[PDB]
CSV table of C-alpha atoms in Angstrom, one decimal:
chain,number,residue,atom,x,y,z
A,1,UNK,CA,14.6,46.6,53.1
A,2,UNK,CA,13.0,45.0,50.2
A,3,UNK,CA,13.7,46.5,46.3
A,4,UNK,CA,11.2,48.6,44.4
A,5,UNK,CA,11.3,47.9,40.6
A,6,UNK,CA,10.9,50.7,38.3
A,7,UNK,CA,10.1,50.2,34.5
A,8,UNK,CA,7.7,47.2,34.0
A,9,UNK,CA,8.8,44.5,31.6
B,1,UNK,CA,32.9,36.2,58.5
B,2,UNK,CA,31.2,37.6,55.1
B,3,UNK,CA,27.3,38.7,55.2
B,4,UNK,CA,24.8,38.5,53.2
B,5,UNK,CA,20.7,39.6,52.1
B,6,UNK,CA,18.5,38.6,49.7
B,7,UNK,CA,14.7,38.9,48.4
B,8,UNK,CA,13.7,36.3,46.3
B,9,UNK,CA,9.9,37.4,44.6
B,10,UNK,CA,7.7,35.1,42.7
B,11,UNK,CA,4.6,35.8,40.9
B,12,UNK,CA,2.3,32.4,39.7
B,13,UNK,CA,-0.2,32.6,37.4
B,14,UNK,CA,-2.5,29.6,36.9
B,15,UNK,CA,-4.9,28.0,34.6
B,16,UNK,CA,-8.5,29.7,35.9
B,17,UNK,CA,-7.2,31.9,38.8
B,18,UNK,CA,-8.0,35.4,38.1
B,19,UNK,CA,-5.0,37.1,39.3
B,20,UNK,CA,-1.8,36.2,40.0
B,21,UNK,CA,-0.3,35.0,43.7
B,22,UNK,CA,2.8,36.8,45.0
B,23,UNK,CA,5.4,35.7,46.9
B,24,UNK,CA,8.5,37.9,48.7
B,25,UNK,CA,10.8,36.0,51.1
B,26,UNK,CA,13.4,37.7,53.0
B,27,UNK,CA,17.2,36.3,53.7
B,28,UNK,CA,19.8,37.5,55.8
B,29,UNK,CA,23.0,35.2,55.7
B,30,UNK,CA,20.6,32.7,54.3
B,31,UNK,CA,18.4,32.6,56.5
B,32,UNK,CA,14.5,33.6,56.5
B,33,UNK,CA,13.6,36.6,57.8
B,34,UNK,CA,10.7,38.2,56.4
B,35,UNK,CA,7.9,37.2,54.0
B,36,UNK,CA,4.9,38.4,52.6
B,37,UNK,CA,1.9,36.5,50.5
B,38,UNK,CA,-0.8,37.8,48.5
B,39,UNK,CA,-3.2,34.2,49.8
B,40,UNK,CA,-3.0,35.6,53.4
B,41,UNK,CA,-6.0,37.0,55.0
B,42,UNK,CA,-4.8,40.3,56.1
B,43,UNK,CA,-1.8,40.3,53.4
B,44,UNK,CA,1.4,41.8,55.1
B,45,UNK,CA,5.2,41.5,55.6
B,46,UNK,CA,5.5,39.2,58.7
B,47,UNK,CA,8.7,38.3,60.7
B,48,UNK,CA,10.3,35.4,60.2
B,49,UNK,CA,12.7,35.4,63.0
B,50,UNK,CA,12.6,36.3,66.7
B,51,UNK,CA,15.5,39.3,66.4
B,52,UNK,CA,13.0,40.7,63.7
B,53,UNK,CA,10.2,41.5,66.4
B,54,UNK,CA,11.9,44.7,67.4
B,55,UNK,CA,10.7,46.5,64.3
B,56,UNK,CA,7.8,48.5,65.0
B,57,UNK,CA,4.5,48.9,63.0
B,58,UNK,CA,5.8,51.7,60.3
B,59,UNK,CA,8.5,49.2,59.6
B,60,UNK,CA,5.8,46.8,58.7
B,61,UNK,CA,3.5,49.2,56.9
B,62,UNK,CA,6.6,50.7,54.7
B,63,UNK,CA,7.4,47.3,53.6
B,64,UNK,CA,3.9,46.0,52.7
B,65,UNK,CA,2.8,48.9,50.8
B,66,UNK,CA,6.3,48.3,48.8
B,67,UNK,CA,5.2,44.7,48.6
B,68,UNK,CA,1.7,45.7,47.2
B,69,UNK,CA,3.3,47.7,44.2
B,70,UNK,CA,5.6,44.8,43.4
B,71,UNK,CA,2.9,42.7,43.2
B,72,UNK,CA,0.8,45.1,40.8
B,73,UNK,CA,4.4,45.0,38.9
B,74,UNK,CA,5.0,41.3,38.5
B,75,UNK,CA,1.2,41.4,37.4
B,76,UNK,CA,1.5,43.5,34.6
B,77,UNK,CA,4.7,42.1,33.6
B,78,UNK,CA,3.3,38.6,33.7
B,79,UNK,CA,0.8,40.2,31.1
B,80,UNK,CA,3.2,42.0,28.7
B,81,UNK,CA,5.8,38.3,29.2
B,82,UNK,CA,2.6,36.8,27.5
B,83,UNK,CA,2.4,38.4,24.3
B,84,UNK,CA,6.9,38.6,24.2
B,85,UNK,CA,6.6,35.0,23.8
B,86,UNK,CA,3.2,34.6,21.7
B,87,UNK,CA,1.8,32.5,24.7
B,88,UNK,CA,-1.9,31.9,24.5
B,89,UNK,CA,-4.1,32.4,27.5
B,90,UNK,CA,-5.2,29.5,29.7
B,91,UNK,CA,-1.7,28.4,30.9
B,92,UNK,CA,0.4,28.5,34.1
B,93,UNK,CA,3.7,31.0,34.1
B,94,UNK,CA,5.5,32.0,36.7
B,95,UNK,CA,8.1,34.8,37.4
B,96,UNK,CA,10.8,35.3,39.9
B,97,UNK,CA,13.6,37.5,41.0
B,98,UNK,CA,16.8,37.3,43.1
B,99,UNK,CA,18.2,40.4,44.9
B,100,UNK,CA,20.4,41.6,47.4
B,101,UNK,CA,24.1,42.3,48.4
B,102,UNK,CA,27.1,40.1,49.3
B,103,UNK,CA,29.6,41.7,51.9
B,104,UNK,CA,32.3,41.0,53.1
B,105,UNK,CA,33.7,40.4,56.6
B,106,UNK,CA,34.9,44.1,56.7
B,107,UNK,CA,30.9,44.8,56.1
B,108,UNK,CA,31.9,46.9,52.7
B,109,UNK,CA,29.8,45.5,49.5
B,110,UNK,CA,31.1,42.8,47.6
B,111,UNK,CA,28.3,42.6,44.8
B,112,UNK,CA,25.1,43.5,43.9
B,113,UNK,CA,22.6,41.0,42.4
B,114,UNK,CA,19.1,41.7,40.0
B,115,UNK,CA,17.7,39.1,38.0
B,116,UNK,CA,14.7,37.7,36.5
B,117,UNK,CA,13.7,34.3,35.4
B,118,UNK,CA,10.5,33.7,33.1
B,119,UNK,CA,9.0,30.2,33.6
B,120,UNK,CA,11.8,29.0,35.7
B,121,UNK,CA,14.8,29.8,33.1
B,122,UNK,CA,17.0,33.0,33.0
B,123,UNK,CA,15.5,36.0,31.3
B,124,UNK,CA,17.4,38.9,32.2
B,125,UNK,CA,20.0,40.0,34.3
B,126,UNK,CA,22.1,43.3,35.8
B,127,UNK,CA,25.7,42.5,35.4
B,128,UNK,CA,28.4,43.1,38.1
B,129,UNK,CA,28.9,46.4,37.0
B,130,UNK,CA,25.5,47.6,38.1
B,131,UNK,CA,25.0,49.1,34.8
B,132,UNK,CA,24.3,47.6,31.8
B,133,UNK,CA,22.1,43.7,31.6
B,134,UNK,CA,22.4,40.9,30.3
B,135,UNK,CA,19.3,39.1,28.3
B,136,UNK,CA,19.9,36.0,25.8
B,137,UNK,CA,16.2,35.3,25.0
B,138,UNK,CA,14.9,37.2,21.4
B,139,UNK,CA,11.3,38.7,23.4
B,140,UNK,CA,14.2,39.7,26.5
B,141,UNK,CA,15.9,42.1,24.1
B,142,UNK,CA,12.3,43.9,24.4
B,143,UNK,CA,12.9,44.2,27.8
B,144,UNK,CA,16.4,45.5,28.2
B,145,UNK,CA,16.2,48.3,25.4
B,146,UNK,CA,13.0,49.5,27.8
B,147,UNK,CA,15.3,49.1,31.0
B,148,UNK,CA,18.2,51.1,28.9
B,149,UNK,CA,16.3,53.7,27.8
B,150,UNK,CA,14.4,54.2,31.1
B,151,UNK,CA,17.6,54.1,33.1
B,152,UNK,CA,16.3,51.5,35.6
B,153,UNK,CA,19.7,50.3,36.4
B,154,UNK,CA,20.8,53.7,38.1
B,155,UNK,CA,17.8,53.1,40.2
B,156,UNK,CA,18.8,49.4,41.2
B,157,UNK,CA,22.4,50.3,41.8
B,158,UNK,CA,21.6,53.4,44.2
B,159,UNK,CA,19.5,50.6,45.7
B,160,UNK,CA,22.4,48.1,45.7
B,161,UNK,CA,25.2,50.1,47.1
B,162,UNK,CA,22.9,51.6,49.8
B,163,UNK,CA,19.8,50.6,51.5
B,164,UNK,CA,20.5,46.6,50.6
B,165,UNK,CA,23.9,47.3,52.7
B,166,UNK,CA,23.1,50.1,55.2
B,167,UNK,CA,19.4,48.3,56.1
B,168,UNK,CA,21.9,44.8,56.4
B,169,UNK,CA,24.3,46.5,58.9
B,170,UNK,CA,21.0,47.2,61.0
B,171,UNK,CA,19.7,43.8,60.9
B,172,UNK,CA,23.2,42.2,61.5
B,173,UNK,CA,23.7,44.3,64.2
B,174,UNK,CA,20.3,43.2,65.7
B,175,UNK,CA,20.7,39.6,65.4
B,176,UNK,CA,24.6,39.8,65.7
B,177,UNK,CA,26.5,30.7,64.7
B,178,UNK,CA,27.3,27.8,63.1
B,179,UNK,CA,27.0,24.0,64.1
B,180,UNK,CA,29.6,21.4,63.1
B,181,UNK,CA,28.8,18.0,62.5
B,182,UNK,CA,29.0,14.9,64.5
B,183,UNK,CA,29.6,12.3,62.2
B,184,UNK,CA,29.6,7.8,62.8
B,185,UNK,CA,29.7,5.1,60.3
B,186,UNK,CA,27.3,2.1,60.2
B,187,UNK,CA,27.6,-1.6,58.8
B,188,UNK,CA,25.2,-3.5,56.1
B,189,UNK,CA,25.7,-6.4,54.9
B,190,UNK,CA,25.6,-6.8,50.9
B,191,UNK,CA,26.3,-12.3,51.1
B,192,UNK,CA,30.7,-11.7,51.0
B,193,UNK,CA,30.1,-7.8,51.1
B,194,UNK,CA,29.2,-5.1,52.9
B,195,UNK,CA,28.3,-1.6,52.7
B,196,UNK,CA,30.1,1.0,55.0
B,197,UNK,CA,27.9,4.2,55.6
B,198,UNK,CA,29.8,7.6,56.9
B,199,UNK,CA,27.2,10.3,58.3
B,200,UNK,CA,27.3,13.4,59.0
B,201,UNK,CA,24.4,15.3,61.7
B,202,UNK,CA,23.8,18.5,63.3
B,203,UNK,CA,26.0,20.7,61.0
B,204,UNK,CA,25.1,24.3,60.1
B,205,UNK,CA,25.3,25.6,57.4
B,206,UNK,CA,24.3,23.5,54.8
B,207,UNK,CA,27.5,23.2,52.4
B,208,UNK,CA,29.5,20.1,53.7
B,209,UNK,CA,31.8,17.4,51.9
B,210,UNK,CA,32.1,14.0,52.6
B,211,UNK,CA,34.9,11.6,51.3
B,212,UNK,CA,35.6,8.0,51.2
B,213,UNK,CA,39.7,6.8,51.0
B,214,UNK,CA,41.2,3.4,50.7
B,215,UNK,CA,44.2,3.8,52.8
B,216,UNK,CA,45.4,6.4,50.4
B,217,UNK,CA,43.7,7.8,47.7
B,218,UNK,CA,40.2,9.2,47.4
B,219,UNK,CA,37.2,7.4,46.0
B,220,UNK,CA,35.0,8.9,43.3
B,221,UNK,CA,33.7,6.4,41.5
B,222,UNK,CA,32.0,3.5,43.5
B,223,UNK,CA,30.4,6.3,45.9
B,224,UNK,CA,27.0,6.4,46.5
B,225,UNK,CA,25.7,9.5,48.6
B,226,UNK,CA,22.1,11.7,49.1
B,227,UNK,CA,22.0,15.6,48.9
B,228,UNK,CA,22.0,17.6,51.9
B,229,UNK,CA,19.1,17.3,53.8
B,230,UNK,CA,17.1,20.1,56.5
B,231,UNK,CA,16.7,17.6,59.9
B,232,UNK,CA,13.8,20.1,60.7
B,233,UNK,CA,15.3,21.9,63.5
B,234,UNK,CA,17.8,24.0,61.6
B,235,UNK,CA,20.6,21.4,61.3
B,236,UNK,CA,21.0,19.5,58.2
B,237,UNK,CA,22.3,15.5,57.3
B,238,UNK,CA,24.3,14.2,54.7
B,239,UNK,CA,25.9,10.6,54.4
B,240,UNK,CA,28.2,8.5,51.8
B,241,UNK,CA,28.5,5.1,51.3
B,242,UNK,CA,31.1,2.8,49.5
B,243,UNK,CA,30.4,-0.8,49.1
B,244,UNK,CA,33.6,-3.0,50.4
B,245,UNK,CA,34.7,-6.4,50.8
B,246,UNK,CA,33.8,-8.1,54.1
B,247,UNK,CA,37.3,-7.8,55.7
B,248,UNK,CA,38.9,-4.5,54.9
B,249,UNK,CA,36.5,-2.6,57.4
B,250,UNK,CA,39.2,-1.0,58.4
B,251,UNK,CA,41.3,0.1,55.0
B,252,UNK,CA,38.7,2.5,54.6
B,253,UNK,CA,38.4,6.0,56.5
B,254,UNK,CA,35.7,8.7,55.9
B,255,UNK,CA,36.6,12.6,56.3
B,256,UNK,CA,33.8,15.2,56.9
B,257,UNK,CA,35.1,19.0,55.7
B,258,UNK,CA,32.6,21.4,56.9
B,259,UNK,CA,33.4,25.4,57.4
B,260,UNK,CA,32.7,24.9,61.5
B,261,UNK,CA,35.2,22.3,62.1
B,262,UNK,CA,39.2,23.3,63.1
B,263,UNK,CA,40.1,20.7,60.6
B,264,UNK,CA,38.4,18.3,59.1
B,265,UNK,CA,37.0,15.1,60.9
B,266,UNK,CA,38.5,11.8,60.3
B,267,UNK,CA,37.1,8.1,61.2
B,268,UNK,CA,36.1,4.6,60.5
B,269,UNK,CA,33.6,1.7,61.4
B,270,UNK,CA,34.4,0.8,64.9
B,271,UNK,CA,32.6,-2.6,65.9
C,1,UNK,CA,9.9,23.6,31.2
C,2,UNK,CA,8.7,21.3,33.9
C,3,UNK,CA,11.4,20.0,36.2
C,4,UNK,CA,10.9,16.6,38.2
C,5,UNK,CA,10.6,16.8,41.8
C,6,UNK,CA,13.8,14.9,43.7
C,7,UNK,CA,12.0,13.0,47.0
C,8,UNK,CA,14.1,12.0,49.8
C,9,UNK,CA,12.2,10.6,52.9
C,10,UNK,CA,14.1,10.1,55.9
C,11,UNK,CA,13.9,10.9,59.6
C,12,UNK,CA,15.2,13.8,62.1
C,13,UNK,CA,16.3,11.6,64.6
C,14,UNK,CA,18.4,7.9,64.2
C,15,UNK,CA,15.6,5.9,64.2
C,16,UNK,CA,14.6,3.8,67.2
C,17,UNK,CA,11.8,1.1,67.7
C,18,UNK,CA,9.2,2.2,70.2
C,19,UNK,CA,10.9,6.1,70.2
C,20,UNK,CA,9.0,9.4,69.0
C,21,UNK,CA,10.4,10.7,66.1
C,22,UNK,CA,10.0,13.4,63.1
C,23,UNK,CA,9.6,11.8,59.6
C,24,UNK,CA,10.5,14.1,56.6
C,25,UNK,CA,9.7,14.6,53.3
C,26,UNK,CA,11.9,16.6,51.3
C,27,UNK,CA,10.7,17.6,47.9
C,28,UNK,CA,13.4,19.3,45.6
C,29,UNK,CA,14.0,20.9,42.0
C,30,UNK,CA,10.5,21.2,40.8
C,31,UNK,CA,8.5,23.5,38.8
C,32,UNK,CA,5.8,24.8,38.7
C,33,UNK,CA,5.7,25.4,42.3
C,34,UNK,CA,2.0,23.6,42.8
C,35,UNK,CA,2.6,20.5,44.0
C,36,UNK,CA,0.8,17.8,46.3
C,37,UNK,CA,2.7,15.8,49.1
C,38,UNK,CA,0.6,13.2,51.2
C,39,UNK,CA,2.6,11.0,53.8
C,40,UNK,CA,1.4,7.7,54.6
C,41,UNK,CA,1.2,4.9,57.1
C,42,UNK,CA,0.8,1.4,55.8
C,43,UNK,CA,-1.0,2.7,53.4
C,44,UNK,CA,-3.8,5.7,55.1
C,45,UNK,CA,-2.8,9.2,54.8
C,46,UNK,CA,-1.4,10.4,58.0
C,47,UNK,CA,-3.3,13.6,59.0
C,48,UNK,CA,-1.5,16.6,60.7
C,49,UNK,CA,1.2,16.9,58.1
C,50,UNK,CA,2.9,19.8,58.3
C,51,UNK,CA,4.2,21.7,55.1
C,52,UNK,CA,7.3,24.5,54.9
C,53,UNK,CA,6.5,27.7,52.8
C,54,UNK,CA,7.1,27.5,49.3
C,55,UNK,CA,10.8,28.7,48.7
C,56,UNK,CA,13.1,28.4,45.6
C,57,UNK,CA,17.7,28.3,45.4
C,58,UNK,CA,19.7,29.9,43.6
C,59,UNK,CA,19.1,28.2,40.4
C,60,UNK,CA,15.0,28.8,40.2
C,61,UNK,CA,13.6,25.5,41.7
C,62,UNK,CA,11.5,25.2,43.9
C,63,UNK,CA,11.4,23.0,47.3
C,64,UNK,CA,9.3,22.0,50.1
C,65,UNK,CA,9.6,20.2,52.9
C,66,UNK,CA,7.0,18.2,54.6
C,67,UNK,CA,7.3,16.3,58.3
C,68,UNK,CA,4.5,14.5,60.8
C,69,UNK,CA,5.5,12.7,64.3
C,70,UNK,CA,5.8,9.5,64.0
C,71,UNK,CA,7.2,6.4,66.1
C,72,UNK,CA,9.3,3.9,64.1
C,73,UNK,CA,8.6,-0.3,64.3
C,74,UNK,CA,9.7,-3.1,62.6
C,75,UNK,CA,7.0,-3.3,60.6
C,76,UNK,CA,5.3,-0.3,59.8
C,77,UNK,CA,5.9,0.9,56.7
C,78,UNK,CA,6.3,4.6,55.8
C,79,UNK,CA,6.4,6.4,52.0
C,80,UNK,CA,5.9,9.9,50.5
C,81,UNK,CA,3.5,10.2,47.4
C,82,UNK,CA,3.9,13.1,45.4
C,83,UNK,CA,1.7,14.6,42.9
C,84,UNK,CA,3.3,16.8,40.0
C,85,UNK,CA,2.9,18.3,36.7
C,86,UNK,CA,5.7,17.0,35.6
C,87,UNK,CA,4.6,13.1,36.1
C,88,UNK,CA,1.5,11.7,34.2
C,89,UNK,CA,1.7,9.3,37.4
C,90,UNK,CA,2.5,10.4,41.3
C,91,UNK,CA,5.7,9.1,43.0
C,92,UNK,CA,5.6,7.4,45.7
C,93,UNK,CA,9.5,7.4,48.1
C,94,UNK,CA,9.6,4.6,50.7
C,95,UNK,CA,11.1,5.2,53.8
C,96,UNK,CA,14.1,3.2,55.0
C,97,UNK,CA,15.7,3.1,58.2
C,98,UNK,CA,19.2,2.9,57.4
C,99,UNK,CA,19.3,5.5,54.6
């Protein structure tokens, strides 16, 4: 189960 | 024994290419399990280990669509990283990220992990805590009053503490070994001296010590040695050498420590 | 920064004269991850060299590891030659047989 970033940098 | 997964992303922008390649390889207990790369033809999540195969194809699709919005993410992050550090266009960056969940050998989670590097050095982190980050460059600070105002770290931790651990039980539980070393030490002349080589074969995993005595105490300087090495096959080599003179073969006795052995291994040229 | 690729070039097996082998060459701590890695026979390029997926440790560097078959004599000479941003001029790693 790979992450999912929110907010961009 | 303690368990482990991880994802480490990267994101490569070069010189003329128009838009960035993406990377996303997969680790359970450090070992490859799953990747995905923007280059491929049909660009998808792929297994990367037999026990994998049993996933069926809304597995696959749930992951690659997640692997397609990360890879929109890392592009427009690569974009805004440009202007943080006043870089011009025209040269090559990269970015990368590290994360996943440590447990231990009761299964329960033993720490989360998030971070980011920017051209290959540290640019910001989530702490232990899960909730607050760490960033020491000036353009990170940027970054982590966006992530603090946003809240991304409640996101991250939920992330942490659940799917990275419950989605690990799963695939541990699918694929529910290590290999100890055989180690033999070989001769070479050096005219009056010789050099006495201790290796070590076969072992898994990777992290392994070798050690060199004079019929006592251990030798630190005068040892000469190579980092651990992949054989190819999934085992790895190591060896360490100590230059000696030409009659005290046998004053000198290597020991291999290695997390597979019942204790560690003990022995010395034998002509 | 750029960091310098470590080489090591060694074989799978305990090298024997007149045996098949695998020969390896294992390319450490670089970045940027683009990178060239040719293998060589006394000299010519060996063709078929297979390349591992680009993959980076803990610490951010990069690695790759490159292998070909290959049976050992006592005179043929084996190297690694690696092109990288961080070297105005590639490296080139011998093997040896007893290391």
């Amino acid at each position: 189960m790979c992450p999912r970033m929110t907010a961009v940098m | 024994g303690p368990h482990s997964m991880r994802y480490f992303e990267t994101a490569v922008s070069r010189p003329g290419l128009e838009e960035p390649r993406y990377i996303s390889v997969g680790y359970v207990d450090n070992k490859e399990f799953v990747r995905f790369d923007s280059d491929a033809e049909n660009p998808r999540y792929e297994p990367r280990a037999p026990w994998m195969e049993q996933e069926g194809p809304e597995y696959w699709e749930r992951e690659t669509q997640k692997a397609k919005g990360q890879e929109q993410w890392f592009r427009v992050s690569l974009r805004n990283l440009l202007g943080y550090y006043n870089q011009s266009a025209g040269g090559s960056h990269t970015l990368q990220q590290m994360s996943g969940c440590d447990l231990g050998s009761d299964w329960r989670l033993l720490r989360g992990y998030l971070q980011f590097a920017y051209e290959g050095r540290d640019y910001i982190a989530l702490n232990e805590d899960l909730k607050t980050w760490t960033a020491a460059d000036m353009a990170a600070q940027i970054t982590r009053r966006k992530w603090e105002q946003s809240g991304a770290a409640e996101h991250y931790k939920a992330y942490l503490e659940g799917e990275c651990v419950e989605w690990l039980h799963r695939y541990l539980k699918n694929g529910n070994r290590t290999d100890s070393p055989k180690a033999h030490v070989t001769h070479h002349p050096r005219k009056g001296e010789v050099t006495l080589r201790c290796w070590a074969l076969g072992f898994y995993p990777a992290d392994i010590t070798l050690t060199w005595q004079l019929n006592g105490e251990e030798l630190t300087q005068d040892m000469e040695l190579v980092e651990t090495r992949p054989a190819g096959d999934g085992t790895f080599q190591k060896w360490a050498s100590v230059v000696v003179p030409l009659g005290k073969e046998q004053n000198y006795t290597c020991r291999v420590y290695h997390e597979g052995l019942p204790e560690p291994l003990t022995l010395r040229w034998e002509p | 920064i750029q960091k310098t690729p470590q080489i090591q070039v060694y074989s799978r097996h305990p090298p024997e004269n007149g045996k098949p082998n695998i020969l390896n060459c294992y390319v450490t701590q670089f970045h940027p991850p683009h990178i060239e890695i040719q293998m060589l026979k006394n000299g010519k390029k060996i063709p078929k060299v297979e390349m591992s997926d680009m993959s980076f440790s803990k610490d951010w560097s990069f690695y790759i590891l490159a292998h070909t078959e290959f049976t050992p004599t006592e005179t043929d000479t084996y190297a690694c030659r690696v092109k990288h941003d961080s070297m105005a001029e590639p490296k080139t790693v011998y093997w040896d047989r007893d290391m």
